[PDB]
Design a protein around this nucleic acid. Structure first.
Length: 1326
RNA sequence: CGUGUUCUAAUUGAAGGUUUUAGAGCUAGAAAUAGCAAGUUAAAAUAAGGCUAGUCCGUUAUCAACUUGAAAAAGUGGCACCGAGUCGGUGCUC
DNA sequence: CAATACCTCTTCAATTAGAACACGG
DNA sequence: TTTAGGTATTG
């Protein structure tokens, strides 16, 4: 006789229970435990809060990291295992010192000095070769045998930090001189293209190409010197290509299909080559000439140093950085001595202040130290060039800085190679292992290979040819690499909804194509002059149509049918076709795709070869990497010409279908012995449809399927709640709410509800890049003209201006950067139709009156001027298809009366699909009973509501919701949603299809919805009491019921249950604190004394436990008795459970009482004394446990007082509210007294409270809007949970935390329900 | 069907940061002190660590209590009424 | 004791897959 | 992107 309404949010879940007259019931419960009480009475409405659920994204980037960090450790491992024999010969302990290089001299086992043991020599190496990049030049240059331990020393370093694989190819650093290389291209292109010459013109190609200027520009700067060549003309692309780019010369050679080329991209050498043959072999020389330049320029940025001396340029730049520090370090210090020597300690000796002494020795970034000395360099004189260097960002470079990592790995490998080549003569073992050693630097598992697991990884999927250990060297052979690649993908791709078991067919499969075609053809009707009835296409006719027309054309069209087949074959001079649009919707595209590739039409037609064409496409869809693609294209390799095969690889396919293969031809109807495809070709008689067939009872197809949906019988609840497409947090809630219902029903005597009413409610650097790119494609200097910062664009009217590129969207005029305030944000589509605050639906222009009518999308006039302008933006990606299409809409007829009706509806019916399964799951769990007909006995209605019913209802009925005041409102919001949705479908059963779960003309529809919520009101002239005119049933009573709502709303006691959740996650703050004399510090590794070595700190605690036990005090070690809290940290927790006592004793608690220990999750609740209540938060601290049941009038009063966004109300009413603000303006004192009395009673943090009071007291003069909003601020001290910062108008009130758990220890412990209804109460004295 | 954004799940890379150690500091001066020279680099751990010993796994999800289960998860607590500062009383069942 | 006041690893690359959602045709 | 438990500091 009751109904349950619930609110499901990210962090909260609101529930309620309602009588037959919208009252809320009031039951007396039991209370297990030792306390005197044996029952308590509580209301039937409330909310269960919790911590927001957390996504796996951080955890995965950890998952990734750990797999990542160790592999790098492994590379440093293979060098040693290569080296071990020859290193012991040379040195016994070199490797041992390195492993133990970290340990303290006292704990050091071998000689402290890693490289040579001796103190004297190590000093020597460090001063001939002071930075490891001074050593890296030597052994790529020197032709004199060198100490092996220096050689390994070089090698690991490159391997440990190796360079990025963004670019894959081979680099011959014979490319140092760009000018020479470029000029050589001018030559070979002239020879190729005698007719139109190029003249070199003495461009500082090295100078032009070399420069930092943006990549697109340089090719422009180069073509600005040429005498009159087009940018995109053949030369231009080539030039553009060497510089990293993906130009296109398809337009100069008019290839039918676009021919795009990246040197960097893996698919280049063939790609040009696959292309190159197609333009003649002659050019091929031209591109290589281009690559050779690319190599010389490509590396240009790492070193501008003359190539000619050095075969190891990259390392050389670092030596250069070192020198350019030194003299600028002498000259700075020297200059400071020359001027302002007095302030010289701060700059160098003192770490704290960002001084150079800070820079080397303190936590001072390169950007933190450059902006410290900025005044000083400027203040100083004789420093002028120095200034220039810094502005360049070159002032005092360090060898490791954030940027490196635009160093490709192929010079780090360029330099590994030089060393081996250099010294393999001295040492035979290198030539034996040069390949291995290079392979260590070279080798990266691909993504599709996955973790090299052996059956123990939830994550990994690879499969093994040989079970021997995998080493970079043996890799291809051990891993079933291709097969593994098909495994990568076949776990993230779909299964048929109809058939769970069969994995979905790829999109470009011929069979889907013979299915789509034969299906769209099944319902073609045709008529001619002679016939009585227009009739279906016959089986003979369809096959004839598919074979002739479709197999001959990509697209088959209506008059292709009329004249090509009927006239040619059936000779109907003229015909009428009912079935189709201008052309058939499907096409036999894949059939056509192939015909071009292999040119054997009968082959495609032949049935026997048909499983090849699906295992061609399943392999062509399935794979990304062209080398990978080849492997399974060998299996069918024998038949085709070699020339085709090369062609075959290129046309890769994408996307996947929804239909399987046993469907389309998989299953056979028993009586008719035909599969759907069979059915589709030749069904009739009548030509049945896929949909039809799947519901033809006469047919077995529905029946057979029936088993398929059933198999596995669904899955248990979280197994299902964790597969719904949505927020991780939202799913957590979805679960929690059902755990509420099964109680609320359990509570209501296991009596199922009449109605269950559900609601759900609804970047800093992202803005920077999108603009960054957009201007670049646009090429405007507007970004240059005015620059801005990454922290600035959370303000739209600023941010919008940039996407619009400083021009009026509706006006074609430039914009005032400074006075954005005068201008107006305009939402393209009016808010009344839809509520959109997105960058997608907003625009900024001076006046929002130039778009057009208030009541429509931007006017035809607006589109005409700037439709074109809107294209530059879309291409720039400065706007979007959603943003664009609406903007251009008006020429689409804009918003029809049909459109408007649609928006007004969607405000009220929830179409959000995440809120659907949730609705569905309730119905399924709730209604299990089955009637004699297959039909379902729906005994609980489910209802989904949009927020706007309830949110508006408070606005129009004096039920205002103030979020800040109490955590209660989340619970009122079920109640309202309960009675709203119950009373709705008691007046309009017709809407039950829309509002409840289970199976032009618009203008009126607009009316039907807009006024739907009228009936509650007395005047809009409505009768007080509502009814169903059909059933003669009462639904509403304006007088009695409204009063009831107020009675429910202001109820003093609501159930508010912070979920007790055990803490999880990282053990402690990731930061590694320096060695300290503290027992707080945690030893980073099991041997490493943090007093000695440093450690972590700040461990989080998965749950605390009360030990009532004894410890010894004093020399006597007398055993006293304690009862304290011991938090068990998350490192510790695993250890605890194996045995607590042994673990507990270890801490030193003695004669621990085994039975007494009680696990306490974070957020546990104790009520001590006055009814002041507290939630555990950490072992040492507790949280505000109390809620404020503010009498409503104060709740109502404030909402108006804050006066949010001024007033949105209808004008006459606004007068009505205001007097009451100041009739009851004295209420403000009432509120403070309410906080003031309560704060004294429960919050119990007086030291602050006087402080708070005073702020209000001296601000009595200030207006209510000011004072009024702020009192709302002041609620923050009050609120359930943990202290945070807050202020009155300018006065900031710091928090007061609760610093020990002692006061809990002889107090009541409350273990409540998932609802707060059932409790068990524990008086802690013992 | 086409397209596009957004968000989620997985995999495989790069660059910094941090932490002890190694880069013979000197000149005075009994000393705290005070004069100047030096600084740019490397090694190593990078969740403690687990057994299934992999170039594997190690921060998501799920969690009142009590009886019971390995775990999953099943089982446990009268009703009415009048009233309201976090549930208080009444009558009834019991 | 419990009042104040500081601290909290970061920023980039590449590849697949699928909902969900909103424009067009 | 800011909270809200851990840390040692000062009165």
């Amino acid at each position: 006789k009751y109904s349950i309404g619930l609110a499901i949010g990210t962090n909260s879940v609101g529930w309620a229970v309602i009588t037959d007259e919208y009252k809320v019931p009031s039951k007396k419960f039991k209370v297990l435990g030792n306390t005197d009480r044996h029952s308590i009475k509580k209301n039937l409405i409330g909310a269960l809060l919790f911590d927001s659920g957390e996504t796996a994204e951080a955890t995965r980037l950890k998952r990734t990291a750990r797999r990542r960090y160790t592999r790098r450790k492994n590379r440093i491992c293979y060098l040693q295992e290569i080296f071990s024999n020859e290193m012991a010969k040379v040195d016994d302990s070199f490797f041992h010192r390195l492993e133990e290089s970290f340990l303290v001299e006292e704990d050091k086992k071998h000689e402290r000095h890693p490289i040579f043991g001796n103190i004297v020599d190590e000093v020597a190496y460090h001063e001939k070769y002071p930075t490891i990049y001074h050593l890296r030049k030597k052994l790529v240059d020197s032709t004199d045998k060198a100490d092996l331990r220096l050689i390994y020393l070089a090698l690991a370093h490159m391997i440990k930090f190796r360079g990025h694989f963004l670019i894959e190819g081979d680099l011959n650093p014979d490319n140092s001189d760009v000018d020479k290389l470029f000029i050589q291209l001018v030559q070979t292109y002239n020879q190729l293209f005698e007719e139109n010459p190029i003249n070199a013109s003495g461009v500082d190609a090295k100078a032009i190409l070399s420069a930092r200027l943006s990549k697109s520009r340089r090719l422009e700067n180069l073509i600005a010197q040429l005498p009159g060549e087009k940018k995109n003309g053949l030369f231009g692309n080539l030039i553009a290509l060497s510089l990293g780019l993906t130009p296109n010369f398809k337009s100069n050679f008019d290839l039918a299909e676009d021919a795009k080329l990246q040197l960097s991209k893996d698919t280049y050498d063939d790609d040009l080559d696959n292309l190159l043959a197609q333009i003649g072999d002659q050019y091929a020389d031209l591109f290589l000439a281009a690559k050779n330049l690319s190599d010389a320029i490509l590396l240009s940025d790492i070193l501008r140093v003359n190539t000619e001396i050095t075969k190891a340029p990259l390392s050389a730049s670092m030596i250069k950085r070192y020198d350019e520090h030194h003299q600028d370090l002498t000259l700075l210090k020297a200059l400071v001595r020359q001027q302002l020597p007095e302030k010289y300690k701060e700059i160098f000796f003192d770490q704290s202040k960002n001084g150079y002494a800070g820079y080397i020795d303190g936590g001072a970034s390169q950007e933190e130290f450059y902006k410290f000395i900025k005044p000083i360099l400027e203040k100083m004189d004789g420093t002028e060039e120095l200034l220039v260097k810094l502005n360049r960002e070159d002032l005092l470079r360090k060898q490791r800085t954030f940027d490196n990592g635009s160093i490709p790995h192929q010079i780090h490998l360029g330099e590994l190679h030089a060393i081996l080549r250099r010294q393999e003569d001295f040492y035979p073992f290198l030539k034996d292992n040069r390949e291995k050693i290079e392979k260590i630097l070279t080798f990266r598992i691909p993504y599709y290979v996955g973790p090299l697991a052996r059956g123990n990884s939830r994550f990994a999927w690879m499969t093994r040819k040989s079970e021997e250990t995998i080493t970079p060297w043996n890799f291809e052979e051990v891993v079933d690499k291709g097969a593994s690649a098909q495994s990568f993908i076949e776990r993230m791709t779909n299964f048929d909804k109809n058939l769970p078991n069969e994995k979905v067919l790829p999109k470009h499969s011929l069979l889907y194509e013979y299915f789509t075609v034969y299906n769209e053809l099944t319902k073609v009707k045709y008529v001619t002059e002679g016939m009585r009835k227009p009739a279906f296409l016959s089986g003979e006719q369809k096959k004839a149509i598919v074979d002739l027309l479709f197999k001959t054309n990509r697209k088959v069209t209506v008059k292709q049918l009329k004249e090509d087949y009927f006239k040619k074959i059936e000779c109907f001079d003229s015909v009428e076709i009912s079935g189709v649009e201008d052309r058939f919707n499907a096409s036999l595209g894949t059939y056509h795709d192939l015909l071009k590739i292999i040119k054997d039409k009968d082959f495609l037609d032949n049935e026997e070869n048909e499983d090849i064409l699906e295992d061609i496409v399943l392999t062509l869809t399935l794979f990304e990497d062209r080398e990978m693609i080849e492997e399974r294209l060998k299996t069918y390799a024998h038949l085709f010409d070699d020339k085709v095969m090369k062609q075959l690889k290129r046309r890769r396919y994408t996307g996947w279908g929804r239909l399987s293969r046993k469907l389309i031809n998989g299953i056979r109807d028993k009586q008719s012995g035909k599969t759907i495809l069979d059915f589709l070709k030749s069904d009739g008689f009548a030509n049945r449809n896929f949909m039809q067939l799947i519901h033809d009872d006469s047919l077995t197809f529905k029946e057979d399927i029936q088993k398929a949906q059933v198999s596995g019988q669904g899955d248990s609840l979280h197994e299902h709640i964790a597969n719904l497409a949505g927020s991780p947090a939202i799913k957590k809630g979805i679960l929690q709410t059902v755990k509420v219902v099964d109680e609320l029903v359990k509570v209501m005597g296991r009596h199922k509800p009449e109605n269950i009413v559900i609601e759900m409610a609804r970047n800093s650097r992202e803005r920077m890049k999108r603009i960054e790119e957009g201007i670049k494609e646009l090429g405007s200097q507007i970004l240059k003209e005015h620059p801005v910062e990454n922290t600035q664009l959370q303000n739209e009217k600023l941010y919008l201006y940039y996407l619009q590129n400083g021009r009026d969207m509706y006006v074609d005029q430039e914009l005032d950067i400074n006075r954005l305030s005068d201008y107006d944000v305009d939402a393209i589509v009016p808010q009344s139709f839809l509520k959109d605050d997105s960058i997608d639906n907003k625009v900024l222009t001076r006046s929002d009156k130039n778009r057009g009518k208030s009541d429509n999308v931007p006017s035809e006039e607006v589109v005409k001027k700037m439709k074109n302008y809107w294209r530059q933006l879309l291409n720039a990606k400065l706007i979007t298809q959603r943003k664009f299409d609406n903007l251009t809409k008006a020429e689409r007829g804009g918003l029809s009366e049909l459109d408007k009706a649609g928006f007004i509806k969607r405000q009220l019916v929830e179409t959000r699909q995440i809120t659907k399964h949730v609705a569905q799951i309730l119905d399924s769990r709730m209604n299990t009973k089955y009637d004699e007909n297959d039909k379902l006995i729906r005994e609980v209605k489910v209802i989904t509501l949009k927020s706007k019913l309830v949110s508006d209802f408070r606005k129009d009925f004096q039920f205002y919701k103030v979020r800040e005041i109490n955590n209660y409102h989340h619970a009122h919001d079920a109640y309202l949603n309960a009675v709203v949705g119950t009373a709705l479908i008691k007046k309009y059963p017709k809407l039950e299809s829309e509002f409840v779960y289970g199976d032009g003309k618009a203008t009126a529809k607009y009316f039907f919805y807009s006024n739907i919520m009228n009936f509650f009101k007395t005047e809009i002239k409505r009768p007080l009491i509502e009814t169903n005119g059909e059933t003669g049933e009462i639904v509403w009573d304006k007088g009695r019921d409204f009063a009831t709502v107020r009675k429910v709303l202001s109820m003093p006691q609501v159930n508010i249950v912070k979920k007790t959740e055990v803490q999880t996650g990282g053990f402690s703050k990731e930061s590694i604190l320096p060695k300290r004399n503290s027992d707080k510090l945690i030893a980073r590794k099991k041997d490493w004394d943090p007093k000695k070595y440093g450690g972590f700190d700040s461990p989080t605690v998965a749950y605390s436990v009360l030990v009532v036990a004894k410890v010894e005090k004093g020399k006597s070690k007398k055993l006293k008795s304690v009862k304290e809290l011991l938090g068990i940290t998350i490192m510790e927790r695993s250890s605890f459970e194996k045995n607590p006592i042994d673990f507990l004793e270890a801490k030193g608690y003695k004669e621990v009482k085994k039975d007494l220990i009680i696990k306490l999750p974070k957020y546990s609740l104790f009520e001590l004394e006055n009814g002041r209540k507290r939630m555990l938060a950490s072992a040492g601290e507790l949280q505000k446990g109390n809620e404020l049941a503010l009498p409503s009038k104060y709740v109502n009063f404030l909402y108006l007082a804050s006066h949010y966004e001024k007033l949105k109300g209808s004008p006459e009413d606004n007068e009505q509210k205001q007097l009451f603000v100041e009739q009851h303006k004295h209420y403000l004192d009432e509120i403070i007294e309410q906080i003031s009395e309560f704060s004294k009673r429960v919050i119990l943090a007086d030291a602050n409270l006087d402080k708070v009071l005073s702020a209000y007291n001296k601000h009595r003069d200030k207006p209510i809007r000011e004072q009024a909003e702020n009192i709302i601020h002041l609620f923050t001290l009050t609120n359930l949970g943990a202290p945070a910062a807050f202020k009155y108008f300018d006065t900031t009130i710091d928090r007061k935390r609760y610093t020990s758990t002692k006061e809990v220890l002889d107090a009541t412990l409350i273990h409540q329900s998932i609802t707060g209804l059932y409790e068990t109460r524990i008086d802690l004295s013992q």
